[PDB]
Amino acid sequence: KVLRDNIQGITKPAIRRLARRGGVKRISGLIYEETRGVLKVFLENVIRDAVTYTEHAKRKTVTAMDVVYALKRQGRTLYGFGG
Amino acid sequence: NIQGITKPAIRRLARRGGVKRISGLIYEETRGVLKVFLENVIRDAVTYTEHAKRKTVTAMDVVYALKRQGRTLYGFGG
Amino acid sequence: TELLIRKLPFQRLVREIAQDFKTDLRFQSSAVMALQEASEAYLVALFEDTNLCAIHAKRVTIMPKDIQLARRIRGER
Amino acid sequence: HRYRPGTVALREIRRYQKSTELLIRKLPFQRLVREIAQDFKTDLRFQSSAVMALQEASEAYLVALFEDTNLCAIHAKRVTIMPKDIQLARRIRGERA
Amino acid sequence: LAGNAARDNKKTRIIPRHLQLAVRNDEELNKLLGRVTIAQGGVLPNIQSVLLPK
DNA sequence: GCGCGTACGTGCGTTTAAGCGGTGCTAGAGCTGTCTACGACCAATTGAGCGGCCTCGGCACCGGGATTCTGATATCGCGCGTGATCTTACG
DNA sequence: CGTAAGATCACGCGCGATATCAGAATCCCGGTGCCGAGGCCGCTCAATTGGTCGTAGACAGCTCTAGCACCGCTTAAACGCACGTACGCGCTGTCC
Numbered sequence A: 001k002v003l004r005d006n007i008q009g010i011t012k013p014a015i016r017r018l019a020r021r022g023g024v025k026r027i028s029g030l031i032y033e034e035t036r037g038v039l040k041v042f043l044e045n046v047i048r049d050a051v052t053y054t055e056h057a058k059r060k061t062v063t064a065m066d067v068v069y070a071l072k073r074q075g076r077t078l079y080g081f082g083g
Numbered sequence B: 001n002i003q004g005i006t007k008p009a010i011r012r013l014a015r016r017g018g019v020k021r022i023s024g025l026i027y028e029e030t031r032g033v034l035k036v037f038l039e040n041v042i043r044d045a046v047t048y049t050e051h052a053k054r055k056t057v058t059a060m061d062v063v064y065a066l067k068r069q070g071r072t073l074y075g076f077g078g
Numbered sequence C: 001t002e003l004l005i006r007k008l009p010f011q012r013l014v015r016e017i018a019q020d021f022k023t024d025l026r027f028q029s030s031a032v033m034a035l036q037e038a039s040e041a042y043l044v045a046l047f048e049d050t051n052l053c054a055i056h057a058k059r060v061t062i063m064p065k066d067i068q069l070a071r072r073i074r075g076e077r
Numbered sequence D: 001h002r003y004r005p006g007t008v009a010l011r012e013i014r015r016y017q018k019s020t021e022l023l024i025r026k027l028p029f030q031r032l033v034r035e036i037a038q039d040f041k042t043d044l045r046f047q048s049s050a051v052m053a054l055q056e057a058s059e060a061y062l063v064a065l066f067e068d069t070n071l072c073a074i075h076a077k078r079v080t081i082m083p084k085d086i087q088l089a090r091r092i093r094g095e096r097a
Numbered sequence E: 001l002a003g004n005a006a007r008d009n010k011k012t013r014i015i016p017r018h019l020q021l022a023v024r025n026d027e028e029l030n031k032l033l034g035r036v037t038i039a040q041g042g043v044l045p046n047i048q049s050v051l052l053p054k
Numbered sequence F: 001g002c003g004c005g006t007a008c009g010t011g012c013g014t015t016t017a018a019g020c021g022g023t024g025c026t027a028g029a030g031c032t033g034t035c036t037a038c039g040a041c042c043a044a045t046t047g048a049g050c051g052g053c054c055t056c057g058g059c060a061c062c063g064g065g066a067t068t069c070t071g072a073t074a075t076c077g078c079g080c081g082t083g084a085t086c087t088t089a090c091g
Numbered sequence G: 001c002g003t004a005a006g007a008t009c010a011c012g013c014g015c016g017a018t019a020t021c022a023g024a025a026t027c028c029c030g031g032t033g034c035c036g037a038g039g040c041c042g043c044t045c046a047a048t049t050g051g052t053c054g055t056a057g058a059c060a061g062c063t064c065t066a067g068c069a070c071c072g073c074t075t076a077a078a079c080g081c082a083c084g085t086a087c088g089c090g091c092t093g094t095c096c
Helices: A014-020 A031-057 A062-071 B008-018 B025-052 B059-068 C007-021 C029-058 C064-074 D007-017 D026-038 D048-075 D083-093 E001-008 E018-025 E028-032
Strands: B073-076 E035-037
Touching: A014 C029, A031 A062, A031 C007, A031 C029, A031 C064, A062 C029, B008 D007, B008 D048, B025 B059, B025 D026, B025 D048, B025 D083, B059 B073, B059 C064, B059 D048, B059 E035, B073 D048, C007 C029, C029 C064, C029 D048, C029 D083, C064 D048, C064 D083, D026 D048, D048 D083, D048 E035, E001 E018, E018 E028, E018 E035
Parallel strands: B073 E035
Antiparallel strands: none
8 A cells, every 4th residue: 555645644743742852842833844854854864774784684674673773873872672 | 371272363263164253252162162172182092192002192093082082084194 | 751753653654764765665563663762862852952042042932943053053964 | 444344354254264274373282282181191292293183173173163153143143153152052062061 | 076176276286175175065975074074174165144244 | 122913822622543452364584404605724926016216397485467346425316395386265 | 356275396405326536355477496296116015826624605495473454442632713912023222
């Protein structure tokens, strides 16, 4: 099944909560689309690295260690999923 | 000593950085920031030189120090 | 500490994203979970920097130019 | 006559951005480096190349920091960089806490 | 790109400023050398709009 | 600091697809047995990059001449304010 | 005839753009020297091949477990409107 416009699956209340955890009190209107774009770029890069790692692995499934490796590459090391 | 980094030299650096108007407290703040940066880089360079059992801090020690700090420099035998 | 982004829309978005790099790709649920954790930590940090920018503008409401400034200063593109 | 304030500053901006020579006179910077190093280990000797590399890195870092500071000041509708600008830029960079 | 820049600056021998211009002007090379400072490289000419005279 | 326009919060109403469970099918990952290609090393061979030493020049510097660019001032132009002349209305 | 209100022309005053002078910037060119670049010769020191061994990797076959899909159920989550109120934007005074 084709996938389309899933970036709007990131609803306004989700981004609002996320900013709340970031200490933001008042949020402007057009912010939400820009957070969608920024999340889009970040996901693009991280999943690019993970997909390349899977491709070398000759596997048809992305594994958690692939994500952890990609995050370590981006200077964004993550604990709690191995590695 | 630290004041040897003259106010006008800081203005020249800012001008190369594209700054038009500069505040008075800027100069002292920049002296502090430069002090901190040099402290860290020279600390790493000394650590390397000590590990080399040499009384001369060499250029490669400096290059390795900036490489550690993610500030890689070219033109000194990288 | 519980996640703020809802799980299923995020999973659909990630599946679309990966599909555009390469088709017929499957995911371990743990891999999707790690992706979501990384994304949430990143954007919470970004929102913190944005709020810092907005206060610097003698403002209280975060505005898109604030995130642009934060990402420029972060060295992101 | 008199040049209106702010014009000669733009002229220097044009001048220095077209040139690459170091903007800190060597000997005070060398003495500052020697003083800073002395606190870490005594009776130390420096290669001139090492000192030059230190100056290049420091000046480039300062120029980048001033660029970020000017951007931050402009974001505040301002034209003059002030210490809060450097502090905010360093904070967002993550070097200052 | 460095030889191109040197031709633009009307020079026969490449100097580091040519290298800096070539790397920073090119978006992809600039991204590759994102954490690299080139000695005697200088900066690109860039003045913010609001700083310009009216 | 003052003044004015307004974006969106709370609340309410309404609507919906996201989680739990329940089932069912299953894809390629993971773990044993076969089979085979190759790089380190040793001898021996051969040859190329580095350094020393020559030779040569693209540009800095000096000095001079020529072309450009803000700061100041003044005229042209347009817009607003005032008096004179022509017009209309009232006495 | 005489006075009062209105339209138009002439004259005067005020704000903005664009002709000129003038000192500081910038570019170009005649002519010289140089320290760095470039090439040739020697020399070690590096690359390559005859030939061997275990080693890692490739391949094939048996096992199956979480990955995927749908259906039903339940409901927390998402979207639109009244409004008014603090926030955003714009003008203005002061003096650092």
